[PDB]
């Protein structure tokens, strides 16, 4: 009954800020601004943030603090018919650690590779290089940059793989890096939040030291201002386009990461009367703020490339891992004191990742430890078995075709599943549990009910929000493709099973928990729609 609590209030805020400030704060937001009308993109971004993202961010934090249990225990206590939401969501974050962790290992592999005087991705005259290597980025696909060839042909060895069927040799230098990542995640997550809330002081604050000196370094190169122009010069024609509204909606939802049961988990350890509303507004601003700061860090360097290095802007203004692993390191290698900037850049990448992966793992631990007392007792043993499974199957992403394994999980394992889970999460709290019961819960904690704005957003805007994102995400679906390679038809189907394995437990647990409860039909529904609190 007596639940642990944060050693300090900063432990909670830094570990929430940590979970929310990840890699997509640096490798997508700045791109979407350059792509969708510069500073004008801040309007649909800010609106979807205000009506879509923030209301869902606030809702899960208050749910966790109020119900004081992990993901699967809490959703059963809110609407027993929808107890499957907890299982789907703990499975989604279970799959997420089968691939997302490799990006932290990539950053660490580049970190250990940076312990030199001439960074190895500069020139085109190496073993791994091809005749079609060129110094910097181009727009012709057959002719790659030196940093692109270094990543694909030395770090990844992706060229030695003929697709998903051919993973090939296991690259043991990266199995080592993934192990260092999982070891770091362990001795920070095994003693619970007493140690977790302290490790997150380094990992959640270091990106701000790294952003600060890279912002200074970045803003003092020739052509630095030209980059800020591409970043922000407004073109309000974008606002009218329905894509950029769905681009803003999608980015705001993903960057806050609500509904995975990890914000819920962190908040479950709060004191019942903590001002969760204040906390939600503060940490969420710090998240979107960091993305704005980061865009200057990235595009100051981008304009320096275009000005003094002679590259077309659209050839280097990219998103995803391509930006942080080939484009930005290519610019670093041209500036004075290059190996210093690479070191703190890749450490920024890794410390940006550990934070958010702490949350996804904690969501699993807290949800299981709060439903199965067997697990709650033997935790540090249980998370060793968790991270040992993570490492073993993780070896698939350390093989030569390991990027093909990564790409498949990235577009199936969790993307569509989490949108469905959170869609049912919105309807559970607002339409079955009721905004009445929820707003009254918030009043008991923080002293006042949430205004009707938050109530209309939870009840009406958020379902439409999540559908808007999902519809435009399905309109853009095509069978899986990476570069010239097209995935076999069986690999596409297997991706849908991973997407369905989680979501299927909304109705599976429903019909099971429905059939196994006594009474007539209406009796069964009201039994499984009366919350746990209303029965105690």
């Amino acid at each position: 009954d007596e639940r642990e609590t944060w050693s300090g209030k900063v432990d909670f805020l830094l570990s929430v800020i940590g979970y929310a400030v990840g890699l997509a704060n640096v490798w997508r937001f700045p791109y979407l601004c350059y792509k969708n009308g510069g500073g004008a993109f801040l309007v649909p971004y800010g609106i979807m943030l205000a009506v879509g993202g923030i209301p869902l961010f606030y809702m899960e934090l208050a749910l966790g603090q109020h119900n004081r249990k992990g993901a699967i225990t809490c959703w059963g206590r809110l609407v027993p018919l929808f107890k499957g939401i907890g299982y789907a969501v703990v499975l989604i974050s279970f799959y997420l650690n089968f691939y997302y962790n490799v990006i932290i290992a990539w950053s660490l592999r580049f970190f250990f590779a940076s312990f030199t005087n001439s960074l190895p991705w500069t020139s085109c005259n190496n073993i791994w290089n091809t005749p079609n290597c060129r110094p910097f980025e181009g727009h012709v696909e057959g002719f790659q940059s030196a940093a692109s060839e270094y990543f694909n042909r030395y770090i990844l060895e992706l060229n030695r793989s003929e697709g998903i069927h051919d993973l090939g040799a296991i690259k043991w230098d990266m199995a080592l890096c993934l192990l260092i990542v999982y070891l770091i995640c362990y001795f920070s997550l095994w003693k619970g939040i007493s140690t977790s809330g302290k490790v997150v002081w380094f990992t959640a604050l270091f990106p701000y030291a790294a952003l600060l000196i890279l912002l200074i370094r970045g803003l003092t190169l020739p052509g630095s201002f030209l980059g800020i122009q591409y970043y922000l010069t407004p073109n309000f024609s974008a606002i009218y386009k329905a894509e950029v509204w769905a681009d803003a909606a999608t980015q705001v939802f993903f960057s806050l990461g609500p509904g995975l049961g990890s914000l819920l988990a962190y908040a479950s350890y709060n004191k019942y009367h903590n001002n969760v509303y204040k906390d939600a507004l503060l940490t969420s601003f710090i998240n979107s703020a960091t993305s704005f700061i980061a865009g200057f860090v990235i595009f100051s360097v981008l304009g320096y490339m275009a000005h003094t290095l002679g590259v077309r802007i659209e050839d280097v203004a990219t998103s995803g891992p391509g930006l942080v692993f080939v484009v930005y390191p290519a610019a670093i290698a041209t500036m004075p004191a290059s190996t210093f900037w690479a070191l703190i850049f890749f450490m920024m990448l890794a410390t940006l990742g550990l934070d958010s992966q702490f949350g996804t793992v904690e969501a699993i631990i807290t949800a299981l430890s709060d439903e199965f007392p067997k697990i709650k007792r033997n935790r540090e043993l249980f998370v060793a078995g968790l991270f040992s499974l993570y490492f073993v199957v993780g070896l698939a992403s350390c093989t030569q075709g390991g990027f093909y394994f990564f790409h498949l999980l990235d577009r199936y394992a969790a993307g569509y599943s989490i949108l469905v889970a959170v869609f049912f999460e919105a309807i559970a709290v607002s339409w079955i549990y009721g905004t009445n019961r929820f707003s009254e819960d918030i009043r008991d904690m923080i002293g006042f009910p949430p205004g009707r704005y938050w109530q209309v957003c939870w009840r009406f805007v958020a379902p439409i929000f999540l559908l808007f994102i999902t519809v435009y995400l399905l309109i853009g679906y095509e069978p899986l493709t990476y570069a010239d390679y097209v995935y076999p038809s069986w690999a596409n189907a297997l991706g849908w099973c991973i997407a369905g394995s989680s979501v299927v437990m909304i109705p599976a647990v429903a019909i099971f928990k429905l059939l196994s409860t006594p009474g007539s039909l209406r009796q069964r529904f009201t039994i499984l729609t009366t919350p746990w609190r209303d029965q105690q």
Partner: antibody
């Protein structure tokens, strides 16, 4: 335009039981916590019990817990205070006050109903 | 239980003068949660000041509130006869909710 009217209330023997009622009007009763504040004949105010908007969160004074029961009829818009095992220290005027936001206090007060416990 | 006691208990000032009265808590109260009530003789209390300083609907501007921690105070800039009443402070941060001892404001003559 908000109106709170306290009903019930009278003279009771010690140990007896009485139910007080507050008829609310002029606002949506269903989204406002309510409390009962009593004022002794020596004029000192003492909070008695708070019931939340949906009736799911209830708090009592120590002087009063175990003997009083607070409740709402959010359909008919009436607040209630079932009393039992009454002693003479319960003699006071009983006020029905609306207080939903703790940071803003008690917006409106009824004009009171008077209880006397005596033999 | 958080015991709020006020001083002076009874207090006479002639109209026009400044009037200051204090409310002390046996245990600290957050500024967001301390309120003030005016009760005229034979009538119900009326919410007067909420969250330490904020005047309620219809409260004239001569009234003001200040304080923090365990020491708060109500102040009438220039008093009037219609201000003769009894003023109660109240904390709303901890159950049991408690009202202050009260201060009767009476007119000098």
């Amino acid at each position: 335009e908000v109106q709170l009217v306290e009903s019930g209330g009278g003279l009771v023997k010690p140990g007896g039981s009485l139910k007080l009622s507050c008829a609310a009007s002029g606002f949506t009763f269903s989204s406002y916590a309510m409390s009962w504040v009593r004022q002794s004949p020596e004029k000192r105010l003492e909070w008695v019990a708070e019931i939340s908007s949906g009736g799911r969160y209830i708090y009592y004074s120590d002087t009063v817990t175990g003997r009083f029961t607070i409740s709402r009829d959010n359909a008919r818009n009436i607040l209630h205070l079932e009393m039992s095992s009454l002693r003479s220290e319960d003699t006071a005027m009983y006020y029905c006050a609306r207080g939903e936001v703790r940071q803003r206090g008690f917006d409106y007060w009824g004009q009171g109903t008077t209880l006397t416990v005596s033999s | 239980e958080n015991v709020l006691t006020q001083s002076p208990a009874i207090m006479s000032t002639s109209p026009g003068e400044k009037v200051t009265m204090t409310c002390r808590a046996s245990s600290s109260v957050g500024s967001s949660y301390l309120h003030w009530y005016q009760q005229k003789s034979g009538a119900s209390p009326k919410l007067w000041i909420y969250s330490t300083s904020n005047l309620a609907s219809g409260v004239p501007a001569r009234f003001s509130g200040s304080g923090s921690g365990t020491s708060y105070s109500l102040t009438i800039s220039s008093v009037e006869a219609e201000d003769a009443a009894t003023y109660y402070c109240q904390q709303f941060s901890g159950y049991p909710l408690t009202f202050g001892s009260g201060t009767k404001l009476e007119m000098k003559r």
